[PDB]
């Protein structure tokens, strides 16, 4: 059992840039963080990053998300967001290696995009 | 959305046991502990109303359900486990899907 922290609410403007932090307790490690958007039917994988502690983030996603790692957190930035992209953005944190494998799901950050 | 009701305060027993009821079809109930902005899925149970609910791990939480509520019990609590314990009930199937997040049961564990 691990914990995941991310702010409850973030606002973005017409520039379409939103930033939030996904924080987790590392008891060790190789990390994968995935950002999920709560669509009415299912979750949508917005972006994913992997990295080893101390290294820069490797983004599988094609330039939708950028960010950095600072110990036990990742500082994410989403761009291209419009008003209808408003929703709950959940980051899934996987501590993959060395074992044991850990999975954490955050409460999600509500992103309100204005104009 | 949906309304979920749980008591504001609960004091754990001497043996480190605390009980509370979550008041709300295939249902998943998750107990979230909220320390700061951090969330921990302490335990999770899935059931269809009328069945003995099955926990995804049976070492922390026990419970039962009677119609419109979950009678949850958490064992092995120490003072460090004192905090806000959020009750999440999901009405998964049949549709539509409902996500109800309780206000949170503040569990105190003395000594």
């Amino acid at each position, epitope marked *: *059992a*691990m914990h995941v922290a991310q702010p409850a609410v973030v606002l973005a403007s017409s520039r379409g840039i939103a930033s939030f932090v996904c924080e987790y307790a590392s008891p060790g490690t190789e990390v994968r963080v995935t950002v*999920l958007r*709560q669509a009415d*039917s*299912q*979750v949508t*994988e917005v972006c994913a990053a992997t990295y080893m502690m101390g290294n820069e983030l490797t983004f599988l996603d094609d330039s939708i998300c950028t960010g950095t790692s600072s110990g036990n957190q990742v500082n994410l930035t989403i761009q291209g967001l419009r008003a209808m992209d408003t929703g709950l953005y*959940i980051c*899934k944190v996987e501590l993959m290696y060395p074992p044991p494998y850990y*999975l*954490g*799901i955050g409460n999600g950050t509500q992103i309100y995009v204005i104009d | 959305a949906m309304h979920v009701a749980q008591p504001a305060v609960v004091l754990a027993s001497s043996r480190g046991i605390a009980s509370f009821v979550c008041e709300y079809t*295939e249902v*998943r109930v*998750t107990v979230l502990r909220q320390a700061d902005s951090q969330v921990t*899925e302490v335990c*999770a149970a*899935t*059931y*269809m109303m009328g*069945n003995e609910l*099955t926990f*995804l*791990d049976d070492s922390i939480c026990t419970g039962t359900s009677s119609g419109n509520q979950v009678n949850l019990t958490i064992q092995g609590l120490r003072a460090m486990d004192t905090g806000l314990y959020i009750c999440k009930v*999901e009405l*998964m*199937y*049949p549709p539509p*899907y409902y*996500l109800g997040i309780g206000n949170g049961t503040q569990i105190y564990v003395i000594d």
Partner: nanobody
Amino acid sequence: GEVQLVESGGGLIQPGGSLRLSCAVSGFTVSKNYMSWVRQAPGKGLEWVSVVYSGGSKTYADSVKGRFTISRDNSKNTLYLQMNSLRAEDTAVYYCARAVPHSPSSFDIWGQGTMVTVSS
């Protein structure tokens, strides 16, 4: 407690053929849990193919409805996916998981997967 989801029974098949994927489970009782079959087609995202809930009620994606049948055997503690009338659209990696499409859980466990290649 270590939980194991061991898949099997995939492979290559000609169009119109049938296949029966299995998912051998140890660590939880299958007949008293929810499970789902998920697949990823080449150059596509995760598609949730079928769900069974703890009581026994089942859902299917409309792109597999009437051909795919999700099943669980209480004696073998195994989850099955009977795939009939297979087409080239069903070529994917297939996973079982103690998970649900609606929202993720910290208790989601996934199988190691199995390749399904419908081709001729």
